[PDB]
Short mmCIF file of N, CA and C in Angstrom, two decimals:
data_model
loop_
_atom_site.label_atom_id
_atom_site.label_comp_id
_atom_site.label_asym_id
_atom_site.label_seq_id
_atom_site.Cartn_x
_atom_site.Cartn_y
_atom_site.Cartn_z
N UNK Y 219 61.10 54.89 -99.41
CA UNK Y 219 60.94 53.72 -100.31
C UNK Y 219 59.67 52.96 -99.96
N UNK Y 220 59.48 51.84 -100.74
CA UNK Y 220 58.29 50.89 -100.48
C UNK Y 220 58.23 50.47 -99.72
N UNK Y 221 59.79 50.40 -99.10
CA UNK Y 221 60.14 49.46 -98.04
C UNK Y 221 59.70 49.93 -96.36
N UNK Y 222 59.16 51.41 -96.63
CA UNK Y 222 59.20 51.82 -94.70
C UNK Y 222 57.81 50.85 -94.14
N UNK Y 223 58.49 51.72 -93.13
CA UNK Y 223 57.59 50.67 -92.11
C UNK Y 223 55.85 51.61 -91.70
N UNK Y 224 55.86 52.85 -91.76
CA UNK Y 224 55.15 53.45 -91.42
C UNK Y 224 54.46 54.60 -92.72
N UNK Y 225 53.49 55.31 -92.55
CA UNK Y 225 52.63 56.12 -93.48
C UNK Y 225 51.50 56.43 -93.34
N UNK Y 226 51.07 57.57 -93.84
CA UNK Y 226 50.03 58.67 -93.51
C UNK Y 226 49.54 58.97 -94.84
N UNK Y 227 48.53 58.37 -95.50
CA UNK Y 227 47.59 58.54 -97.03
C UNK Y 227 46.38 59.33 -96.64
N UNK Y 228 45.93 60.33 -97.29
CA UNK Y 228 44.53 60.40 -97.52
C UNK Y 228 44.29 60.19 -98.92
N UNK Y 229 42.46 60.43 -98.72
CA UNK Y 229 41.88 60.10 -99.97
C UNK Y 229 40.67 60.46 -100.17
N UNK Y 230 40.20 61.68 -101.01
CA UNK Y 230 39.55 62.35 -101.21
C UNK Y 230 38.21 61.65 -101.91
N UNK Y 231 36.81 61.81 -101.40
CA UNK Y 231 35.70 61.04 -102.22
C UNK Y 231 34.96 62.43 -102.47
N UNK Y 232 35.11 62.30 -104.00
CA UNK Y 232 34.12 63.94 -104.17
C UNK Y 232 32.60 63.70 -104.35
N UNK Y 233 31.82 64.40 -105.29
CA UNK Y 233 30.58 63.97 -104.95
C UNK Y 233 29.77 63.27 -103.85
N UNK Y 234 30.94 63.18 -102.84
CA UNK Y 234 30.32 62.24 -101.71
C UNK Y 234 28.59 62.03 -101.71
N UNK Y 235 27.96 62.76 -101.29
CA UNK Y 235 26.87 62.91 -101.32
C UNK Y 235 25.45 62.25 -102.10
N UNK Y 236 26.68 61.87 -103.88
CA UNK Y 236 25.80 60.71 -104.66
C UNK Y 236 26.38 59.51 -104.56
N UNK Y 237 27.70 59.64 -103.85
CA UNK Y 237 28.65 58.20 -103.61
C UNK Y 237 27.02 57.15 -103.44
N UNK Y 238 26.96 56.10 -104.28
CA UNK Y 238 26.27 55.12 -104.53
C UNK Y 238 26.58 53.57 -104.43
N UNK Y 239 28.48 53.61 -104.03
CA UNK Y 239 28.90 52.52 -104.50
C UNK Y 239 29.94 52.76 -103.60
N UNK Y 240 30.73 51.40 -104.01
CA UNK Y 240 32.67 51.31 -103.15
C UNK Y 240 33.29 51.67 -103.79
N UNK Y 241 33.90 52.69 -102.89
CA UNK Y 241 35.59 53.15 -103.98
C UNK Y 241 36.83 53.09 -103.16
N UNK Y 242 37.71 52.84 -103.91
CA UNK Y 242 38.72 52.35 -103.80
C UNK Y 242 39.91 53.51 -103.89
N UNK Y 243 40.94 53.81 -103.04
CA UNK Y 243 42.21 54.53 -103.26
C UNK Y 243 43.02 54.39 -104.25
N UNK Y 244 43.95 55.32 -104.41
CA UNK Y 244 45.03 54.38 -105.24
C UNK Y 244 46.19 53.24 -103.93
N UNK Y 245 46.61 52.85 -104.77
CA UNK Y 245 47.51 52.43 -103.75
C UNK Y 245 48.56 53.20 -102.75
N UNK Y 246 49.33 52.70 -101.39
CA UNK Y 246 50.29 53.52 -100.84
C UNK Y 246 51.18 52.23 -100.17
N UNK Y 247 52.04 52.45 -100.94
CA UNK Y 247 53.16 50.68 -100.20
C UNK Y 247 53.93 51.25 -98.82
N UNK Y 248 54.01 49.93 -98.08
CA UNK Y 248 54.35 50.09 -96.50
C UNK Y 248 54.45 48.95 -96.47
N UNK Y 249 56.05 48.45 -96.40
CA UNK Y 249 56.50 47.43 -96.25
C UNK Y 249 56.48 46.64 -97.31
N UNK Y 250 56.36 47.17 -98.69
CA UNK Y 250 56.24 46.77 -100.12
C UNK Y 250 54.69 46.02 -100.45
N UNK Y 251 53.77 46.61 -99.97
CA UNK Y 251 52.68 45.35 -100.13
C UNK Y 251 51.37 47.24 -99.96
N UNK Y 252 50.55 46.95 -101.07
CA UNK Y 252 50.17 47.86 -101.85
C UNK Y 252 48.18 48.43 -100.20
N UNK Y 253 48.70 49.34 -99.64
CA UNK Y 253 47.44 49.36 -99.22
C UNK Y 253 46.92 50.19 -99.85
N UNK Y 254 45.39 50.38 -99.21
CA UNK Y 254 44.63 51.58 -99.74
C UNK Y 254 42.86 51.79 -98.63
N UNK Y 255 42.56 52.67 -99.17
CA UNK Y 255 41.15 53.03 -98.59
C UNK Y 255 40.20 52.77 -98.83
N UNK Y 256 38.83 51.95 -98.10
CA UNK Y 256 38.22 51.96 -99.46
C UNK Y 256 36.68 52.36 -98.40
N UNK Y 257 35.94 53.11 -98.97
CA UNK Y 257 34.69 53.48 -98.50
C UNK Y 257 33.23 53.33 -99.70
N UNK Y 258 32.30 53.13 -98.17
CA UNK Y 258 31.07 53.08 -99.27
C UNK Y 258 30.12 53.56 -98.16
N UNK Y 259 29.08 53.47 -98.73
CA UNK Y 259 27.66 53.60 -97.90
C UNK Y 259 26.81 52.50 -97.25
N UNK Y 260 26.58 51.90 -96.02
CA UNK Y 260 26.37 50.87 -95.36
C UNK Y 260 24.73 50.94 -94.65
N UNK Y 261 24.22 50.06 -95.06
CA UNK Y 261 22.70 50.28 -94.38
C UNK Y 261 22.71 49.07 -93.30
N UNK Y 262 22.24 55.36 -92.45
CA UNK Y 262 22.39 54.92 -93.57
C UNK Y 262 24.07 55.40 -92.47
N UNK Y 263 25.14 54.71 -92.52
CA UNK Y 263 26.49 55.13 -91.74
C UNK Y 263 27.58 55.15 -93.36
N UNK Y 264 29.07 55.60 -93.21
CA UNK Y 264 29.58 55.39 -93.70
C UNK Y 264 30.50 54.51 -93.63
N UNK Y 265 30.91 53.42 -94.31
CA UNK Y 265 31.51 52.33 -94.06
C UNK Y 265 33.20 52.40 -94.78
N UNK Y 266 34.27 52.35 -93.75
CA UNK Y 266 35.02 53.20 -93.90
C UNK Y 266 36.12 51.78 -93.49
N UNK Y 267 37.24 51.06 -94.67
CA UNK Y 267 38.47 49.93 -94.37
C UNK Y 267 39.78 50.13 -94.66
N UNK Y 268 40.77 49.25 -94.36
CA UNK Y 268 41.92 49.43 -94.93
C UNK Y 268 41.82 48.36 -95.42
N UNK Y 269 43.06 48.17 -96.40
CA UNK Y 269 42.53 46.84 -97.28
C UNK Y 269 44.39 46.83 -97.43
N UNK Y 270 44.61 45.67 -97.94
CA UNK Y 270 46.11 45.38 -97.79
C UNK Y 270 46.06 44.26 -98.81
N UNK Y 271 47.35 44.33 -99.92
CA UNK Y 271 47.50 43.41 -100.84
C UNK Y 271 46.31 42.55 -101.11
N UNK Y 272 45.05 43.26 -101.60
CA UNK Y 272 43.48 42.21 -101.96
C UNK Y 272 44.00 42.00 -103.43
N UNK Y 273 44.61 41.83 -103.98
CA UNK Y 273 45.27 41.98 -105.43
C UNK Y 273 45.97 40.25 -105.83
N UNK Y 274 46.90 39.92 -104.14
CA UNK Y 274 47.75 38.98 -104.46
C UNK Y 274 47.22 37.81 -105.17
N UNK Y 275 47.81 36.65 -105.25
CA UNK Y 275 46.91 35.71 -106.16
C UNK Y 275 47.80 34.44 -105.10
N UNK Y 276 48.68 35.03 -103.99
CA UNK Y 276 49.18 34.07 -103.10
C UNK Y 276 48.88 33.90 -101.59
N UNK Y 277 48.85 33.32 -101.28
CA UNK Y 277 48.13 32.65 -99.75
C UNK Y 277 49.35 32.96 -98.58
N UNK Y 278 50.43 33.41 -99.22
CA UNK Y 278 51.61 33.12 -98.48
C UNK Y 278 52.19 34.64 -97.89
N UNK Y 279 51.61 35.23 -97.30
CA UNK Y 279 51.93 36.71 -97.05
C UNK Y 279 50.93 37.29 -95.49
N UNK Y 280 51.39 38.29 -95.30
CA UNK Y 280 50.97 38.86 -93.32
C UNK Y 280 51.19 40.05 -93.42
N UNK Y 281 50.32 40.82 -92.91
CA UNK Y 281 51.11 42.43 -91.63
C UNK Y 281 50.52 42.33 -90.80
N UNK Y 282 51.15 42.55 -89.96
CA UNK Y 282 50.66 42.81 -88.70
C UNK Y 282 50.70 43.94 -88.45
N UNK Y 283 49.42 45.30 -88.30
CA UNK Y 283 49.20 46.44 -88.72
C UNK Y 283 48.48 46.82 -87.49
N UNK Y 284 48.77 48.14 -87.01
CA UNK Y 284 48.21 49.26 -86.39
C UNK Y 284 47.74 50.73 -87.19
N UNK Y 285 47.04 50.81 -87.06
CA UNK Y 285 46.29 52.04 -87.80
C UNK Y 285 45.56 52.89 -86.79
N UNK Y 286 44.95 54.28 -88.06
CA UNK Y 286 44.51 55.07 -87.28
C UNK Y 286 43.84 55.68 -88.51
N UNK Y 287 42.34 55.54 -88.71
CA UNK Y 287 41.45 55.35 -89.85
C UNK Y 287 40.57 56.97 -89.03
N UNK Y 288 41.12 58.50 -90.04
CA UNK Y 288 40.41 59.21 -89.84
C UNK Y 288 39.55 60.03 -90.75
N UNK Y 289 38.66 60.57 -90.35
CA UNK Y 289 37.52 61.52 -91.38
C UNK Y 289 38.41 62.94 -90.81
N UNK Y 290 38.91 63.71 -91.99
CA UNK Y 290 39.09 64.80 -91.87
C UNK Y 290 38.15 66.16 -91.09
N UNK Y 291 38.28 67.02 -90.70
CA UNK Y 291 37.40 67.59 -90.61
C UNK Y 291 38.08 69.03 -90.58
N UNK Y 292 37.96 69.45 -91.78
CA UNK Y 292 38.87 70.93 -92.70
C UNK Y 292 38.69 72.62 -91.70
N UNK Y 293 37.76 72.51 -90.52
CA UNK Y 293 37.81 73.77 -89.67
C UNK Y 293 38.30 73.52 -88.58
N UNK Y 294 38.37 72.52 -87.98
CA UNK Y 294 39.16 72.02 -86.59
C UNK Y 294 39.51 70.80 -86.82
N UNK Y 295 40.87 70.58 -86.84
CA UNK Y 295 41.80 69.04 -87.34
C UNK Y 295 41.68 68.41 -85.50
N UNK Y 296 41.37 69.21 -84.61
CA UNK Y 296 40.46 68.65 -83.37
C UNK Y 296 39.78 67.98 -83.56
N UNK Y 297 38.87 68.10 -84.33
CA UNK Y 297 37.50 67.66 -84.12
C UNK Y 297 37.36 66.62 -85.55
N UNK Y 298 38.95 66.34 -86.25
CA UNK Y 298 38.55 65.10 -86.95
C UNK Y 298 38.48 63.78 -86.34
N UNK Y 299 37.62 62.93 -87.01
CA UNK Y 299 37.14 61.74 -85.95
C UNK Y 299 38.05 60.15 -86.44
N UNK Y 300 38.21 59.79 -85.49
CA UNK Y 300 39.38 58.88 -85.74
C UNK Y 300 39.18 58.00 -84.68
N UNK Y 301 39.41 56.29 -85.26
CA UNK Y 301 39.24 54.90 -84.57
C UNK Y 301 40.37 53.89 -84.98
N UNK Y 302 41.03 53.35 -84.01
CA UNK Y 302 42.45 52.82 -84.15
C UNK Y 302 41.69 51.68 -84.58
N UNK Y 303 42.39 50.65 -85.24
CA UNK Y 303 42.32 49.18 -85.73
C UNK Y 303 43.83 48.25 -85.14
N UNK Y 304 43.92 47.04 -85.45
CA UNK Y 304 44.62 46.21 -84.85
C UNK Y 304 44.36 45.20 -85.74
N UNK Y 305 45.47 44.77 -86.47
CA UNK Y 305 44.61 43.24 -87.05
C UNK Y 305 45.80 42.23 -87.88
N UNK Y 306 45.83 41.69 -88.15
CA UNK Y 306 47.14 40.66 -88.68
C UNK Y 306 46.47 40.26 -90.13
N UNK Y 307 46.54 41.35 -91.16
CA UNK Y 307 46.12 41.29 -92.34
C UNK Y 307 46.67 40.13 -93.50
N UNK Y 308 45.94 39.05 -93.64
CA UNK Y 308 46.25 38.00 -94.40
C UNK Y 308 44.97 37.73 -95.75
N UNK Y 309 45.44 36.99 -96.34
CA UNK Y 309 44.77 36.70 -97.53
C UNK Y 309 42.87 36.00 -97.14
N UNK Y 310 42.46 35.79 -96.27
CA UNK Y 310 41.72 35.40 -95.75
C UNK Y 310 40.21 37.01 -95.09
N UNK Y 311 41.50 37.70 -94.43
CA UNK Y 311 41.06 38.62 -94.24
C UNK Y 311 41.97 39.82 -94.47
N UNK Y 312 41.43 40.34 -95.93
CA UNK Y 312 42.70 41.57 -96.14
C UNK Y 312 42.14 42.67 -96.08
N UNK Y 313 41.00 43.00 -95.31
CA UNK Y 313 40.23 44.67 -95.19
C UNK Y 313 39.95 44.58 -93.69
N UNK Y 314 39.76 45.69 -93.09
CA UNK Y 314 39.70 45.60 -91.88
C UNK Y 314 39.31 47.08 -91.58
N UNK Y 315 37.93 47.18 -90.79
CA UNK Y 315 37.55 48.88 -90.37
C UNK Y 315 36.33 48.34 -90.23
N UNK Y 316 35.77 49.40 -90.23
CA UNK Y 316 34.23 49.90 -89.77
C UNK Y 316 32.70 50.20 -90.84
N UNK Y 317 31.85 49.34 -90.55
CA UNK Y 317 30.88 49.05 -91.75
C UNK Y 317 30.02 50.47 -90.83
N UNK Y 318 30.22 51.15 -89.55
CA UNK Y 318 29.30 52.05 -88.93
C UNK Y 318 30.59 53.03 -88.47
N UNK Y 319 31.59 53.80 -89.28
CA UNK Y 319 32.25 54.29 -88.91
C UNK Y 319 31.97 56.03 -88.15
N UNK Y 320 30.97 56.30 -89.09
CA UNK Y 320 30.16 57.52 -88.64
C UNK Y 320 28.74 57.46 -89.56
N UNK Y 321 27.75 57.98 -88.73
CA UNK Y 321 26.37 58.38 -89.42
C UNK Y 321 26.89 59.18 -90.43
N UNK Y 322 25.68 58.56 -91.37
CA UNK Y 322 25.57 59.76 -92.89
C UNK Y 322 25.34 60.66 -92.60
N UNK Y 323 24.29 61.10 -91.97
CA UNK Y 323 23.54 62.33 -92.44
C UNK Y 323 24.88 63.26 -91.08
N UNK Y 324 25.78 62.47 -90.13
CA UNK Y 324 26.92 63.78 -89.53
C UNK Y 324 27.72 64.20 -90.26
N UNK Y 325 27.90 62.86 -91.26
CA UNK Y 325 29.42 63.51 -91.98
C UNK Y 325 28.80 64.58 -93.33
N UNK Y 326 27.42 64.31 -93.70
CA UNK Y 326 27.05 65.01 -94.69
C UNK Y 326 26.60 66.46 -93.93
N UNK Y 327 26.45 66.49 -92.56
CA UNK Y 327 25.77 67.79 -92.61
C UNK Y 327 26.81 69.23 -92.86
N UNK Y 328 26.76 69.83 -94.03
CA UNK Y 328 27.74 71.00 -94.15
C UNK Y 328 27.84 71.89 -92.80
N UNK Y 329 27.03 71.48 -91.67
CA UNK Y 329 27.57 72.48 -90.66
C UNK Y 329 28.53 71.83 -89.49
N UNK Y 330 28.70 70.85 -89.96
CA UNK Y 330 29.87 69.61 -88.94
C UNK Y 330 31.10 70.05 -89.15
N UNK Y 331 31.29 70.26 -90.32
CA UNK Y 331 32.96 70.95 -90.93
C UNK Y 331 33.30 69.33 -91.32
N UNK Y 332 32.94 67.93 -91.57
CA UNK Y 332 33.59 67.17 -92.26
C UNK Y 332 33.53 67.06 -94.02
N UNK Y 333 32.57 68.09 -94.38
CA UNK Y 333 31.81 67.79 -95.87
C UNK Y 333 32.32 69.56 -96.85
N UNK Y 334 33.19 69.19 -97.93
CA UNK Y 334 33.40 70.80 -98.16
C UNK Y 334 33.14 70.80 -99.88
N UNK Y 335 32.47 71.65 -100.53
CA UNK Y 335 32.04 71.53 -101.59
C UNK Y 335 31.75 70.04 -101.98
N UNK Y 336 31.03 68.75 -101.50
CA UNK Y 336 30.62 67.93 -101.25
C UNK Y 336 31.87 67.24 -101.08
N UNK Y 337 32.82 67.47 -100.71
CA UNK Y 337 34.24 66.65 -101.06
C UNK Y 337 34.49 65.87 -99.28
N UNK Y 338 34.88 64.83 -99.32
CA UNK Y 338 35.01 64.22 -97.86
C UNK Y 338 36.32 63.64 -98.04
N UNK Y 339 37.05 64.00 -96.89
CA UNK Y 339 38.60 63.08 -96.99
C UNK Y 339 38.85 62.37 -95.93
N UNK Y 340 39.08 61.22 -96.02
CA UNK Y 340 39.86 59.90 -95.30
C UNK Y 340 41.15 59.81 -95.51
N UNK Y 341 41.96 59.92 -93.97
CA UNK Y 341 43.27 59.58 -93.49
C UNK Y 341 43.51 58.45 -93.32
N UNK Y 342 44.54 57.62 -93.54
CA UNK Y 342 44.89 56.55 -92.57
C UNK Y 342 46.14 56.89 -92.33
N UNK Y 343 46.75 56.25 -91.50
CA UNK Y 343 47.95 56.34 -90.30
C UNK Y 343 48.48 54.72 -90.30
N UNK Y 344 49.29 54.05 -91.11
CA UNK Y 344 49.41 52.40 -90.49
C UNK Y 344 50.68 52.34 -90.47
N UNK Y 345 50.97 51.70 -89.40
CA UNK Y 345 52.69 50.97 -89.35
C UNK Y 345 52.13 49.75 -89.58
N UNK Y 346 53.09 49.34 -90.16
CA UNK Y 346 53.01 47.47 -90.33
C UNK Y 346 54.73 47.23 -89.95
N UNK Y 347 53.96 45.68 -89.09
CA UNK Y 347 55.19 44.78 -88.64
C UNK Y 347 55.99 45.38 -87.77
N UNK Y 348 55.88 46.43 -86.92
CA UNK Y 348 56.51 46.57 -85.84
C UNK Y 348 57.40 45.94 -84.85
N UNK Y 349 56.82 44.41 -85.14
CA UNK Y 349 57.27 43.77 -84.53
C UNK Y 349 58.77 43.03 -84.62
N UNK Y 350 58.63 43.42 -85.92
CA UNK Y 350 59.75 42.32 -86.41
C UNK Y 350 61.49 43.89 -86.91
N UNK Y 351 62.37 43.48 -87.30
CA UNK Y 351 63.60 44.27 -87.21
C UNK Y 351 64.74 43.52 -87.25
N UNK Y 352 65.79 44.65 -87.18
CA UNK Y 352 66.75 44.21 -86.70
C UNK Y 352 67.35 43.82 -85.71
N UNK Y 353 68.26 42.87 -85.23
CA UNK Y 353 68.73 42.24 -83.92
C UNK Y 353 69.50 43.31 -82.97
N UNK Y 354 69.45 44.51 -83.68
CA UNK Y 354 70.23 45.69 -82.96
C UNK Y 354 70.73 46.47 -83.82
#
């Protein structure tokens, strides 16, 4: 349901290579509150967030989120590259990652194994609210 606590999305950016702009996932709910991926090109690195309910129109909402924000890499799932986050996602600040997550020209070079018919995929990994439960 919408309701778990935990989840594992990717999200495929094709053309990577003319990617010019920010794009955005579809959504994936965790804990009923709509995340997603969103990458662009950062001045050249790739700039790589999670973003959590940027939609709401209310001030009155939280996760408290652990993640695990990775670049696929389709010949050795070893050698995909991956950086944990930590952050208490509120209306103030609802994206959270890396404006230098990896150099362009590594993730573009077709002999890295992250880039496949120009297609690049981003994992995330987030539990939200761990903290909170039942009394037993």
């Amino acid at each position: 349901t919408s309701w778990r606590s935990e989840a594992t999305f990717q999200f495929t950016v094709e053309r990577f290579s003319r990617l010019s702009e920010s794009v955005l996932s579809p959504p994936c709910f965790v804990r009923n509150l709509p995340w997603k991926i969103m990458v662009m090109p950062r001045f050249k690195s790739v700039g790589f967030f999670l973003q959590c309910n940027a939609e709401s129109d209310s001030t009155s909402w939280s996760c408290h989120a652990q993640a695990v924000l990775k670049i696929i890499n389709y010949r050795d799932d070893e050698k995909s590259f991956s950086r944990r986050i930590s952050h208490l996602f509120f209306h103030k600040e609802n994206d959270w990652g890396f404006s230098n997550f990896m150099a362009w020209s590594e993730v573009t070079d077709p002999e890295k194994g992250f880039i496949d018919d120009d297609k690049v995929t981003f994992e995330v990994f987030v539990q939200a609210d761990l903290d909170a439960g039942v009394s037993e």
